[PDB]
Design a protein around this motif. Sequence first.
Motif, PDB file in Angstrom:
ATOM      1  N   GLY C  52       0.797  -0.976  -0.021  1.00  0.00           N
ATOM      2  CA  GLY C  52      -0.005   0.068   0.014  1.00  0.00           C
ATOM      3  C   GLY C  52       0.866   1.361  -0.181  1.00  0.00           C
ATOM      4  O   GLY C  52       0.230   2.507   0.158  1.00  0.00           O
ATOM      5  N   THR C  71       1.467   6.251   2.189  1.00  0.00           N
ATOM      6  CA  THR C  71       0.062   5.796   1.712  1.00  0.00           C
ATOM      7  C   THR C  71      -0.763   6.681   2.370  1.00  0.00           C
ATOM      8  O   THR C  71      -0.743   7.759   2.966  1.00  0.00           O
ATOM      9  CB  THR C  71      -0.016   4.454   2.418  1.00  0.00           C
ATOM     10  OG1 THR C  71      -1.140   3.636   1.525  1.00  0.00           O
ATOM     11  CG2 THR C  71      -0.408   4.267   3.785  1.00  0.00           C
ATOM     12  N   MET C  73      -4.956   6.731   3.462  1.00  0.00           N
ATOM     13  CA  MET C  73      -5.877   5.752   3.693  1.00  0.00           C
ATOM     14  C   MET C  73      -7.033   6.592   3.759  1.00  0.00           C
ATOM     15  O   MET C  73      -7.319   7.825   3.596  1.00  0.00           O
ATOM     16  CB  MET C  73      -5.248   5.612   5.213  1.00  0.00           C
ATOM     17  CG  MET C  73      -4.046   4.828   5.362  1.00  0.00           C
ATOM     18  SD  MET C  73      -3.474   4.640   7.373  1.00  0.00           S
ATOM     19  CE  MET C  73      -3.761   6.416   8.080  1.00  0.00           C
TER      20      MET C  73
ATOM     21  N   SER D  49      -5.409   5.368  -3.686  1.00  0.00           N
ATOM     22  CA  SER D  49      -6.053   4.570  -2.376  1.00  0.00           C
ATOM     23  C   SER D  49      -4.983   3.822  -1.785  1.00  0.00           C
ATOM     24  O   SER D  49      -4.684   2.755  -2.710  1.00  0.00           O
ATOM     25  CB  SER D  49      -7.391   4.098  -2.426  1.00  0.00           C
ATOM     26  OG  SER D  49      -7.493   3.655  -1.237  1.00  0.00           O
ATOM     27  N   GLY D  50      -4.339   3.891  -0.740  1.00  0.00           N
ATOM     28  CA  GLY D  50      -3.795   2.656  -0.321  1.00  0.00           C
ATOM     29  C   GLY D  50      -4.546   1.485   0.530  1.00  0.00           C
ATOM     30  O   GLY D  50      -3.744   0.551   0.996  1.00  0.00           O
ATOM     31  N   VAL D  51      -5.862   1.565   0.908  1.00  0.00           N
ATOM     32  CA  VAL D  51      -6.663   0.760   1.232  1.00  0.00           C
ATOM     33  C   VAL D  51      -7.476  -0.509   0.589  1.00  0.00           C
ATOM     34  O   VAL D  51      -7.689  -0.007  -0.389  1.00  0.00           O
ATOM     35  CB  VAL D  51      -7.342   1.164   2.412  1.00  0.00           C
ATOM     36  CG1 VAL D  51      -6.613   2.227   3.473  1.00  0.00           C
ATOM     37  CG2 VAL D  51      -8.395   2.051   1.875  1.00  0.00           C
ATOM     38  N   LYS D  52      -7.594  -1.494   0.999  1.00  0.00           N
ATOM     39  CA  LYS D  52      -8.581  -2.586   0.645  1.00  0.00           C
ATOM     40  C   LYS D  52      -9.647  -2.310   1.696  1.00  0.00           C
ATOM     41  O   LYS D  52      -9.474  -2.211   2.899  1.00  0.00           O
ATOM     42  CB  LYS D  52      -8.077  -3.743   0.285  1.00  0.00           C
ATOM     43  CG  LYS D  52      -6.905  -3.633  -0.712  1.00  0.00           C
ATOM     44  CD  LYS D  52      -6.083  -5.071  -0.998  1.00  0.00           C
ATOM     45  CE  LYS D  52      -5.755  -5.398  -2.580  1.00  0.00           C
ATOM     46  NZ  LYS D  52      -4.660  -4.512  -2.663  1.00  0.00           N
ATOM     47  N   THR D  69      -4.255  -1.395   5.142  1.00  0.00           N
ATOM     48  CA  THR D  69      -3.253  -1.234   4.127  1.00  0.00           C
ATOM     49  C   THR D  69      -2.166  -2.071   4.614  1.00  0.00           C
ATOM     50  O   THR D  69      -1.943  -2.136   5.817  1.00  0.00           O
ATOM     51  CB  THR D  69      -2.875   0.290   3.856  1.00  0.00           C
ATOM     52  OG1 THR D  69      -1.930   0.391   2.884  1.00  0.00           O
ATOM     53  CG2 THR D  69      -2.347   0.812   5.118  1.00  0.00           C
TER      54      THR D  69
END
Lengths: 161, 162, 161, 160
Positions: C52, C71, C73, D49-52, D69
Amino acid sequence: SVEIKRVDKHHCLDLVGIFIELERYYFGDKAASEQDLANYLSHQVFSEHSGVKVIAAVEHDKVLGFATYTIMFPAPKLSGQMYMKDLFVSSSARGKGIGLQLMKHLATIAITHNCQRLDWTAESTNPTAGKFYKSIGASLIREKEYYRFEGNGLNKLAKSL
Amino acid sequence: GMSVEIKRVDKHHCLDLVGIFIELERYYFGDKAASEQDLANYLSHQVFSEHSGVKVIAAVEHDKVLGFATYTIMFPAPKLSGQMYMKDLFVSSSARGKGIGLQLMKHLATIAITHNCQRLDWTAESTNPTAGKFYKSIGASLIREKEYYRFEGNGLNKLAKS
Amino acid sequence: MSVEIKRVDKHHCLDLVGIFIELERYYFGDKAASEQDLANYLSHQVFSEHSGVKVIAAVEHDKVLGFATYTIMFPAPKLSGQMYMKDLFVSSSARGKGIGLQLMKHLATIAITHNCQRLDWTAESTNPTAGKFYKSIGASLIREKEYYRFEGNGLNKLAKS
Amino acid sequence: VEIKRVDKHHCLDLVGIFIELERYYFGDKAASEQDLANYLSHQVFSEHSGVKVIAAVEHDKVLGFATYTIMFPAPKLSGQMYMKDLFVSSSARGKGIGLQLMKHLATIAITHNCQRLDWTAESTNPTAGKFYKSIGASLIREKEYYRFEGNGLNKLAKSL
Ligand SMILES: [Cl-]
Ligand SMILES: [Cl-]
Ligand SMILES: [Cl-]
Ligand SMILES: [Cl-]
């Protein structure tokens, strides 16, 4: 002598010199700093959400000019419509036909990627540009109307969602 | 939820746009509209391709597409920002008076200001006065200084060869 | 001056091997990972479909002087993103050039141009000089924040139970 | 109750639960449905975006979600997983949903070489702290959380 090549993300900072010149030309004292532009180049112009690619004219490891373009859809005859956002030639490369070479190169990309059109705009307050464009065989499309939301107008629309 | 949804259309679902594209082709090109098979290849190989610079949002109700917009973000632009450009806004004649056009543009505007754009630009045709009135009515400005230039077909080939 | 800040992408991820070797010694001394392990780590984990983070680095004469991983969030208040800086590292051989702060200026710029209203990160209370540096550039310590963790066996048990 | 990742093609499945989350934290200041659909579509699910996002679903209703993340670098040549948010629908209280979401995250964590799952809580929300401790979590007291925001974040950016 003068080579035109696409600038990839790993070399985006090569464009800093020429963007500074572009910034000064268009905005004078309000021109952005070199670190601003480096950031802009790395994380905006060459972001994942950027629609443009960038080609540059290079002579002796210096950038003499650049153009940015995008390919849009949909368009007539099952094809793309290429759109050139900016064309810029360094005052230091003037008189060498850099702009024409950049546009010939763009024309080449268009045909190899199934575009039947290459479009762009100019300002009527810069009648020189139009003369140049007309002189190289471009057609002026008078039926085209150009609309825009910006600043607060743009914000009010967004907020009305 | 809401009846009419606005959502992104991605490569994996691009054929969902076939119906609305047939309608668009008939509008712009009448007799010369493309076939279904050709539109499906157009969508899969060109509209959604490595070289394509646009994304697509669509208004959907009952699993039918009522309208769509394609848009892109162009650089450079003033104030170290991006310039959003809407290539096409198209709404089906059967979805008229549902305020789909405005709805699509509200989403575009929101994308624009959350992605460092301070402008949203597009063109209309003088031969299509109704579009002009619609745009001005939602508060859009006409930029009379802009001049639109073009190379196409043979002129484009001549330019490339020379 | 001759120091550029640039993005590091997957295709050039091995450029980070030298500075990672330094970071490994700094935190783990003799338990530092080998060069081979770090190349694999960079190639298969740090830059990976499941990663990420992105990376920006300070580079001078083709040597990496420092880097930051970050990253963005979601969700976060006000329909916006929250940027998080995982690590900031500046080589002992590049101290005094204000590189750490410059890397943070860049991150801050990425945050505000990508709809973030926050840039967050952590430090160790056992590393007092970091906290001092952070306060001195205007950062707020968020005392109400509590940091929780599952690791190793506890992690294996949580997943297994 | 099934736990699975929500991909971009289904991001609008989260509108309902996101609406509830907004009411719960921002009361009257809650964002509207369309705002939320746009947020999910173009930010939460974007290339930057860094999140799932994982969700717990029961009878086609979303009962809760978590976003996470995976960050680098970290010790022992591995990733550190970080949970940004955990949210359970008030209408699903007492079903152990929060715990189930985290076990699933843990499963993702060990199959992607993460030695750590980290997150934060607010001390003004002691029930959250108590819950986390009760499922085996350790408080890392030495961790200091720092932030730039609003005008402070702007001033830092503008000094570039
Ligand atoms: Cl012009
Ligand atoms: Cl896809
Ligand atoms: Cl620290
Ligand atoms: Cl909490």
